[PDB]
Amino acid sequence: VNSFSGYLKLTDNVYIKNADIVEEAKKVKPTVVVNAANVYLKHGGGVAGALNKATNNAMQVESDDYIATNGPLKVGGSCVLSGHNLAKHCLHVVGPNVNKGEDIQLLKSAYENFNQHEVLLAPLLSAGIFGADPIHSLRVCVDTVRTNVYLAVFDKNLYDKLVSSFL
Template sequence: MVVAYKLSNGLEVILENGDITKVEADAIVNAANSYLSHGGGVALAIVRSGGYIIQEESDEYVRRNGPVPVGEVAVTTAGKLKARYVIHAVGPRYGIEGDDKLESAIRRSLEKADELKLSSIALPAISTGIYGYPYEICARIMSKVMKEYKPKFLKRILVVVYGDQAYSVFKKVFDNSLYMN
């Protein structure tokens, strides 16, 4: 299941139900924790598919720079993945840190892709797993950020969600917000 949206800022947004580790994009965004310990969910899937080098580089990043603040990002190579980079976005825990931190994590991911002069990025439903964010809130925030973003190099955003329920909610939100540019 795939649906595409063309935004007034020139971005093409593709919503897909699938495995983010299998998509073709210049960068894949990982829904990470502040210590970049990739022990479950999307993070573990990325390390399993891309190789332990991603965890090693993440550990080195934290050793050198300290924990990544909520709402911020860190970058590693992508190991054996089709992507060139993994952008590790630290999303908030629902009900603990605010929606502004989720907005920041998404926006910083897009900004980092532009800083790296990438044309495509794959985003998961950040913070909707163990951090408990409802799909609808994540989709609304993601939609807002993508519509407001002013890309420099970025042309395509793949929003890759896992499961029929997530896809259905994201599609409904995107149909209502992204078609009405």
């Protein structure tokens, strides 16, 4: 038993809710919150901008030190950093940005990072301002992640259709 409440069970291990990941994280304080990062960990907008703002920019300060030491992530890759006031850890995961010509097949590689963590709170990767189809992304998530993932989808009408049309 865990503390996530109000989710719809899509499969044995994937759950979904219409919620803001920032508010879910503050309420639950999960072991792992996933950020929809870019390779530079520049958390300017989208989920990343919202998460970083909720940390009072501490996520960005930590991220800039990480990049100065290690260089950029790979598209499809990830790193584990602090969760600050939102979670124990933040798993920064880079899905492909199709608006940059990046291979959408890399979305599966991105979701594979979730399997290194038994339980996660996460957004749909590559959705929103990353430009991919959120229905597709949900399919890749379900077909790739084997650990327990709680998906927060902030957009109401997108959420409404995802669960009503999920096979």
